[PDB]
Amino acid sequence: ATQSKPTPVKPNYALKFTLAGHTKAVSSVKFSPNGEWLASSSADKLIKIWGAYDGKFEKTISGHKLGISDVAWSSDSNLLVSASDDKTLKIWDVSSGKCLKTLKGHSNYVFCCNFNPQSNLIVSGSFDESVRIWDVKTGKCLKTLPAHSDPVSAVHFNRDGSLIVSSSYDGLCRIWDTASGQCLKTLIDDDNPPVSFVKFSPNGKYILAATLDNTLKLWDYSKGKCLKTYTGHKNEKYCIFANFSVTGGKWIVSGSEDNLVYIWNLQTKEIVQKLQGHTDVVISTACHPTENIIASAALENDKTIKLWKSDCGTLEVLFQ
C-alpha cells in the first residue's frame, strides 16, 4: 500500500503566500513536474521562477521582445518553453536562464505551448490558426497542421505523447495523431461557442474544455460525448486555464472573471469551494503534482500570484 492523501468531501484551501513582482498582467503559472518550482509568464515579457512551497522568488528569465501568453515545463523540470506575442517560442535552460533555441515559423502571436512527455517535442498554437510540432534538440518545425479557422487557444499532448488536443475560437476541439499529423477527431456540440481552453485528463481518456459561455465540459474522447458540465463561474472573454486536481480529492479548478478561484466536485459537478482574495480576473490556476497546493494568478489591476494549500477538509461521518 502507498501513501495517498485523504479524499475529503470538500477541500479547505487557505491562502498562504502572495507573490508580487510582475509589472503587467500575469498570463500563466505552472508547477514544475518535480514539485519544486512555480513558473509564471507575463505581458511584461518576463518569466519568473518561484519556490513551490514558500513562494520565494528564485530568478527572472528575459529575452522575449513582446508579452508572453504561456509557459510550459519539460518532464525533467530542466527546460521551459514560452509562447510570445513576438511570434516566436523560446526554449530556456532553467538553471542558467539562457535561451537555447528560438522557434520561428508562426505568422502571428503564439498563444499556447506544451512539451510532449518524452520532451523531445513541443507543440504550439497561434493566432495564425495553425498548430506546429517542433523538434526540441534542433529547434526546427517538424509539421504545420492547418488546424482551425480562428486563433488556437490551447494545445496539449496526451499521457503517451501519441495524440495532441487543440481548441480554437472557431468553436472546435480537434485531436491529432502526433506521428502523422492526421486529424483523428473533431468535437462539436449542439452549439459552437468559442473554445478558450482544452486539456487531456491525466490518464488520457477524457478532455476538459472551457467555452466562452461560462461553461467547463468534460468530454469522453473516444465517443465524442460530453459527460459532465461545470457552471457557476464567469468566463466570457479570457482564455482561463482549468485544471484536474487529484492529490486530495478529485476536483475541477478554474479561474474566473469575477476574481475568484472555483473548485468543483469532478463527479457530482457541485461547487465545493471559491477562493477569494484576488482583486482582478483570475486568468490562470495550476495544481501541484504531489501536494494539495493551488497557484493562482490575476490580471493588470492585481498583478499578484497566490499560493493556496488545503491540508484538511469536510468529512462525512455516519453516526449510528
Binding site: R159, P202, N203, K205, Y206, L218, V246, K250, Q267
Partner: peptide, 11 residues
C-alpha cells in the same frame, strides 16, 4: 446510473 469517472486510472 452515475458511472464514476476515473480520470487518473491507467487502463
Amino acid at each position: 446510473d452515475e458511472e464514476e469517472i476515473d480520470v487518473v486510472a491507467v487502463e
